[PDB]
Amino acid sequence: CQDVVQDVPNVDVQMLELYDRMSFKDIDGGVWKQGWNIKYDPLKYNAHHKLKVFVVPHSHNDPGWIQTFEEYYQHDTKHILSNALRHLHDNPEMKFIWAEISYFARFYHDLGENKKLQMKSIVKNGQLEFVTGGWVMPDEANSHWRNVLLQLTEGQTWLKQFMNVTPTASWAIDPFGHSPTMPYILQKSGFKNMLIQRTHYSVKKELAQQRQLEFLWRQIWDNKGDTALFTHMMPFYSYDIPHTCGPDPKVCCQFDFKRMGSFGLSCPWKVPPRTISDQNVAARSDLLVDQWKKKAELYRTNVLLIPLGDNFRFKQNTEWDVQRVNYERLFEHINSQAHFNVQAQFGTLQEYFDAVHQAERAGQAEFPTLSGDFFTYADRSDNYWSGYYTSRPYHKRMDRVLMHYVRAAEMLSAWHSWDGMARIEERLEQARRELSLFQHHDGITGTAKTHVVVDYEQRMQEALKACQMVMQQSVYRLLTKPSIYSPDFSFSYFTLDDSRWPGSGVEDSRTTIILGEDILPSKHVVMHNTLPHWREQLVDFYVSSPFVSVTDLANNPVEAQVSPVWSWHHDTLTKTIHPQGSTTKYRIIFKARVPPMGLATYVLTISDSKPEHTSYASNLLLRKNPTSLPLGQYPEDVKFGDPREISLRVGNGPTLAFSEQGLLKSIQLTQDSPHVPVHFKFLKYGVRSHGDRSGAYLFLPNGPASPVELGQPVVLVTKGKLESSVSVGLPSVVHQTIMRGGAPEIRNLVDIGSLDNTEIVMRLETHIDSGDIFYTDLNGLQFIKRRRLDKLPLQANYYPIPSGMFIEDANTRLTLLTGQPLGGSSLASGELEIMQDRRLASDDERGLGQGVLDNKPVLHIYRLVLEKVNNCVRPSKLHPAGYLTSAAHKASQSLLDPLDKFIFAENEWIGAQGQFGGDHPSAREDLDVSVMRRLTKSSAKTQRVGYVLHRTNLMQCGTPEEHTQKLDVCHLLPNVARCERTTLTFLQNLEHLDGMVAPEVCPMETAAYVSSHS
């Protein structure tokens, strides 16, 4: 196992280092506006060394953006694919590449058998080639690596099954900036090459000058280089035709033959394309070949890639003809004119890469190595695309919730083989597909039109219901005496109870467990733990009486705490935001203990009076002019007082101090230790009154943020033995700090209401001496070192915060973990900030055609970890990576993969069992079974179950942390007959395992195993 901490990889280009040295000057470079006038030596090519040119036709199709997936499919995509089939079938030499399997699968299943065969043959013969092969071309900023793998697997599994092909070349031309998480997953999924396009114009210029646009992209911690994946970065501003034939768009535009008039398109550079003829082909070829040779100067081999396409192109037969015929005329002339020393033809992406490597092997080029990422993207001037790290935050939070439900549903039902009548495979496939679809770069990015966002939401909503159905049927089967188990596959044995989604104040969707002497004395509830280690976590449920006690199934009492159900209201009459307590429902909280990847059953029983093992929280409402707050049977009267500072401590945990406005002020780790200054503050960014406007994509602040005026907010303090919290109703945000004994949890109920052109940010101010350094994660997979650069505008120092960020000095670290991807930064030493929501009245000219005015209440959740790190073994100062501590990592897991809670629906659960998985191995804390998926239907003689195992890397800080069991996923199910290591998509067997034992992976590595059972 490589050491991912102590050895700084040696690479030719390290992006943080490059950023430190680069000037980023935006000067006019001529026709190549962001480059320079390329010159080449005409004698470079000759009869013994020709320029091999591959023109690759393509059509960028968005699975929803301006229209919904289905609208686009009916209006454009089905026509594009139908005509591609006809045209490639009839013109053997024509080629075309396709990226989005969601659309292809939709099309193919609608084809008659005769056309399905024609399609399979033009794929088999190399004319139509799939690039990447994912359900979509995902966003790379906000997406969790788990969902990136999920969507890749969904598209490639379909391709293997129906087209009998597995792409080994990736094509990502529209995501806004690129992440190294892509080559990470791709290289572990059989890929050999990848192509990217949207990277900062300054970066393109810099790498172009050094001919480092093609490189071996390895992970920042990879000292050996085994994670390396050959990567081609396109050099220009766009992937459209004007920006793909060479440096001068005024010239290249003339070779987009769809722009002559009848199609309603034209060249903005005022010179239109002209039909190629025998009288102008020599002159047209002169111009084109010159653009090609200039583009070739930016690369190292004699093989040139010329993409030929744009958004939703190749829709009409006449378009296919006009592009094909004119290019064939050019190729015939050019290839027969020796003086050009060029051989051009239509080709696919893989053809290009194969030729490149052939040149490489012939010793004509050697490629530089590179590590780092390509955020934050700017396509021109100061237009940095960091707004989409936050746009439509409700759905960004929804993404993480569904991510977990999908994993829990696939895992819970994987334990058994199911009769087709159970519709398990059906519901799981629909859930994987709707979540996969949302990974699209206009999905989770929040860059689609309003009605399209609604469509993604409804799809995800159906996906959540599908997961619930599968999960509850699974729990019922897993915890019911086999000879008693009598399932109705359409019945709801349990209903899921989720405390954080949609969340309190977002939607009253939770069911109250209704108990009563005259109706029902008790109720069984079950918790599931998808993580592969024993886990304890407080869980809460709503009950119709405060006199409730909890026991496990051996009938041992469980210490519980009851608290009121508080809801915040913006009182339009008193013009204040204050809480109201329920007089009929209450919250019961207790510690659940659940086996690794298992279940644990508990019972809630009503009593006529305060039960022995249940305590009641005190409540204190701080505000001037208070009014009574009755709580029905709740045994403790609410107390009142004028606003004042407060301190709280739960268990032996930290002690936290709050200001009289209910905001954190300091954290004291231990009895003796100091009260470390940690202050939460809320601010707002505006929009510029002149110049470019912020929109769904762009963050263009009109200067540093200004504090939100808080007035004299109402603060509610609940103090309990198991859980305490401080909540305050601020303008646009009900901010809540919850304490259960460890790092506190922070929840923000964000309702930006109608505050137009406003972006609300949550900031932490500390005295940590971080200087200009901070860390943010990439797709929940790794933490990368960031350096605030004052030579760049504010918005450029914003980065995606998909799951966490931290700052530190020699002695102290503050880590903020998130349950949703948002945008953030550290704009000053000792600071951390993350945007909550943004509402923008204007469009930002990238094609969306609207601002962002469809905001809705969202509940953002976080864990805030203050820790001493002076004893931790950390990477040296030049290492580009950072690593979490055990506490920070578990806090992230508590947000992304919490225990699942199920309430039994009928009055009596006959045959109920108290636990499942008690014998499952409790793996070391840095290991996770990211995916558990049964890969075969019940009719298969040999059952197969796939597992994706990921081991992160946690800092060694002196904690002994011992006694853990080896996890062999190949033996989790009985009767194993074979164990194989496979690509992450489970599509290719890479290793036949001895003793049928799946070994554990190394720190920062991910492996997939498939066990076969007889």
Ligand SMILES: *[C@H]1O[C@H](CO)[C@@H](O)[C@H](O)[C@H]1NC(C)=O
């Ligand atoms: C396509 O896959 C392989 C080529 O890699 C070929 O040998 C096989 O015949 C095809 N798959 C089918 C139809 O089983």
Ligand SMILES: [Zn+2]
């Ligand atoms: Zn797109």
